[PDB]
Structures are given as structure tokens and as C-alpha cells.
Scaffold this active site. Sequence first.
Site, PDB file in Angstrom:
ATOM      1  N   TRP A   1       6.552   6.488   7.478  1.00  0.00           N
ATOM      2  CA  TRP A   1       7.022   5.174   6.548  1.00  0.00           C
ATOM      3  C   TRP A   1       8.461   4.476   7.419  1.00  0.00           C
ATOM      4  CZ3 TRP A   1       3.480   2.931   4.308  1.00  0.00           C
ATOM      5  CH2 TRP A   1       2.231   3.489   3.794  1.00  0.00           C
TER       6      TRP A   1
ATOM      7  N   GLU B   1      12.048   3.467   6.297  1.00  0.00           N
ATOM      8  CA  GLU B   1      12.340   3.865   5.231  1.00  0.00           C
ATOM      9  C   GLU B   1      12.177   5.506   5.152  1.00  0.00           C
ATOM     10  OE1 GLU B   1       8.858   3.568   2.022  1.00  0.00           O
ATOM     11  OE2 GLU B   1      10.538   2.279   1.566  1.00  0.00           O
TER      12      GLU B   1
END
Length: 287
Positions: A234, A237
Site C-alpha cells: 500500500w 501508507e
Amino acid sequence: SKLKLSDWFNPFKRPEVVTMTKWKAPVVWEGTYNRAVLDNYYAKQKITVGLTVFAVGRYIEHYLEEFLTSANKHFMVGHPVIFYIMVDDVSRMPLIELGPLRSFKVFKIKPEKRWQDISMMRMKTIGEHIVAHIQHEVDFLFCMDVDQVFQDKFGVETLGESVAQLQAWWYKADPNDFTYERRKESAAYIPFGEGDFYYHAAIFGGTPTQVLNITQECFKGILKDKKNDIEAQWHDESHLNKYFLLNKPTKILSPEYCWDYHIGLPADIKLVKMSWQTKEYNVVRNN
Ligand SMILES: O=c1ccn([C@@H]2O[C@H](COP(=O)(O)O)[C@@H](O)[C@H]2O)c(=O)[nH]1
Ligand SMILES: [Mn+2]
């Protein structure tokens, strides 16, 4: 100095949700904070708050205006605010009228080709801007994803040394279900036994000094991976979560501050200050 947690925060107005961490950081939920008191405390200190936001390519026409318009109306109302707008094409950026105590500046940035590099290069750029001028301009800085909209007051109850956002989709899940990066080859690696919460990278903040460290650690992490030919699942993140595991946030914001209405509207989501709009691929419990 002068401000204690008991001055504005009361966990008992929200007994059914986690309002304090094991390292004693408050988790801000609707009903647990006294804005009235903090507005006075902060305005007396003449606090100024910065907000960075990137919009490149189609994102400019799709989200910049709505994001800025809702920010003008709801972000730290009653306190000086400076919007730092980073776009790849300044001639396409919407010019909205700002209200009392808001002002801004725009910077042209080089557009990356891959959307994952766009979202991850923000880490370096924010860092460069902090040392060049943000450090001298504001007391607290927030860094936000452009594809979201303020719905209600997002105030000084959110300020802190390093502030994190409870990702909306995973706040009840426990660590082993969190989509952290699990490949030990990645700098963002977080072992299956560890982890406190899953933070959403669409909103993070703190003092400029803190934000500098966050962004600097994250970016060197993103480089290392590139060097080892791997990309965290991700992206930024994941790196942010590794960072926040090692350096716990001094304050965490409940999902009411970054709500995805695709999840519906549970008892727990009392008053939404900000909601997602549409997006890239942020961690949802999707396909
Ligand atoms: O094509 C893109 C991709 C990302 N972003 C910036 O990166 C953030 C990362 O969110 P997302 O594309 O992962 O949803 C966006 O909200 C936005 O501020 C852009 O400006 N354009
Ligand atoms: Mn987004």
C-alpha cells in the site's frame, strides 16, 4: 506549556470506543473534546496551521476545488490557516475565494508517470518544503489526500505533536488482519505479531519538525525498497504504518475525521468531519 489532557478531553463521553492508547495518547471522537476551550487557548498563542495538498493530472479538475472549498469553510475556522497547493499544471488550478484567516500559495511540481510514485514522491516534496519555509510559517501542519471533502468542523481538537488517522475500514480489526507490508524484504515490513492500529495515510500531521521526520523516514524507506526492487503493497501508507509503529503518534483521530460512506453509517460514527470521495486504491475490504 500550560495545557493538560484533562483540560479538554473526557474519555467518558465515549465509553464504547477506544479513547486512550496504551502509551496514553487520546483518540479523538465526537463528544470527547472541548473545542470552545481549545479555540481560546490556541488563539491566545496566535497559532497558525498549515495544510498541504497535491493534485496532479485529472485529479485537479476532479477534486481540488471541492477539497479547497470545503477546507476554507471547515478547517481550523477562527485561526490563521495557510493552504500549500502542489499541482503539475498551475494554469488549470481552480481559484476559489478564501474567507477570513485563510490564505495560500501554489507550487508547480514535476508529475510522476506511475500513480504510485506520485503518491510516494509527496513524501520528499513535503520534506523539502518544510525545511525551506513551512517550518518558519506554521505551528502545526497537516498533509492530506486531495480526493476527500470536509463535511463538518475539523478543528484545533485535532492538533498535536504527531497526529494519526484511524483508517475507517479497519478500526475494529486486530493487528493480524491489518494489511501491513508482510514481506521482510520491504522497509515497511511489520511482523505478524506486532502493530497497534492501522493508520490511514490520507491524513497525518503534527509539528513541522515531526512531519519532517515522518516524511523523511518514509521516503528513505520508499527509496530503499526501490533499490531492492520491491514495492510495499500500500505504498506510502505502508511506510507510514511502519513509522508510526516505531514512533507512536501523540494523538490519533477517530474514523469520524476520515469516513468512507461506502462502509455505511454505524452507531460509532457520530459526526463526520471529513469523508472520502472516490480514489486510487487505499486499503478497503474490497476485491
Ligand atoms: O494521479 C494522481 C494520484 C495521486 N495524487 C495525489 O496523491 C494522493 C494519493 O491518493 P490516491 O490516488 O492513492 O487515492 C491523492 O489524493 C492526490 O493528492 C494525484 O494528485 N494524482
Ligand atoms: Mn485518496
